């Protein structure tokens, strides 16, 4: 079916959470007519909701902070779907504060997941993928678990003060 069956739930959720946290969010949905198999439609809402909540809570900064940082005052959250060959690609993008990669590394060292000696040459993907480790810092492990139950993949791109883009890829069947 069309992914609108999932996406149409989100403006109310986004608006309620933004209100609760006294933030202003410009929420844009694209590609809502993208069709995919019912099994995906039935399961993908929960992970997407988690990612949207992360963007509103942890990503987009309060207006006053954005102004102080010389950013546009209202944060933008874009949820998109598209076909790419045999895959459907779903992206959740915010222009908030980004994920703090140094914080991740420090936590990974604390937890014994990496030796300090290996931190300097870690790739960006290797750093951000620590967020999918169970217990790391209801977590992102559960997002990845659902995506993988759908034979999908997930990746994160993020830069300090720029924002965060989470990409889910799903197969045709």
Ligand X SMILES: Nc1ncc2ccc(-c3cnn[nH]3)cc2n1
Residue 89 · residue 81 · CB < 8 Å: yes
Tokens found for residue 158? 């993020």
137 lines the binding site for ligand X (CB under 6 A): yes
Which of 151, 152, 145 minimizes the C-alpha distance to 167?
Answer: 152
Nearest to ligand X by Cβ — which residue? 59
Q: Contact, 105 vs 114, CB < 8 A?
A: yes
Residue among 22 and 117 whose Cβ is closer to ligand X: 22
State the binding string over 152-171 for ligand X (x if CB under 6 A, else -).
Answer: ------------x-------
4-12, 17-25, 26-34, 92-100 -> range binding ligand X (CB under 6 A):
92-100
**Shortest Å distance, C-beta 76 to ligand X:** 12
Provide the b/e sequence for 128-137 (b: ≥16 CB within 10 Å). Answer: bbbbbbeebe
Which residues of this chain interact with ligand X, rule CB under 6 A? 54-55, 58-59, 94, 96, 99, 131, 137, 140, 164
């Amino acid at each position: 079916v069309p992914i609108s069956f999932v996406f149409n739930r989100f403006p109310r959720m986004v608006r309620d959470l933004a209100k609760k946290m006294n933030k202003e969010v410009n929420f844009i949905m694209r590609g809502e007519d993208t069709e995919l198999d019912r099994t995906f439609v039935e399961e993908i809402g929960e992970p997407l909701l988690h990612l949207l909540r992360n963007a509103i809570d942890h990503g987009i900064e309060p207006k006053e902070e954005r102004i102080a940082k010389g950013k546009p005052p209202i944060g933008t959250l874009i949820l998109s779907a598209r076909h790419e060959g045999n895959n459907v690609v779903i992206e959740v993008e915010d222009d908030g504060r980004g994920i703090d990669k140094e914080k991740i590394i420090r936590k990974a060292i604390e937890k014994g997941l990496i030796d300090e000696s290996k931190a300097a040459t870690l790739s960006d993907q290797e750093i951000l993928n620590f967020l999918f480790v169970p217990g790391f810092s209801v977590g992102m492990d559960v997002v990845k678990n659902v995506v993988e139950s759908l034979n999908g993949s997930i990746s994160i791109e993020s830069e300090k003060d720029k924002g965060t883009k989470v990409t889910i890829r799903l197969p045709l069947t």
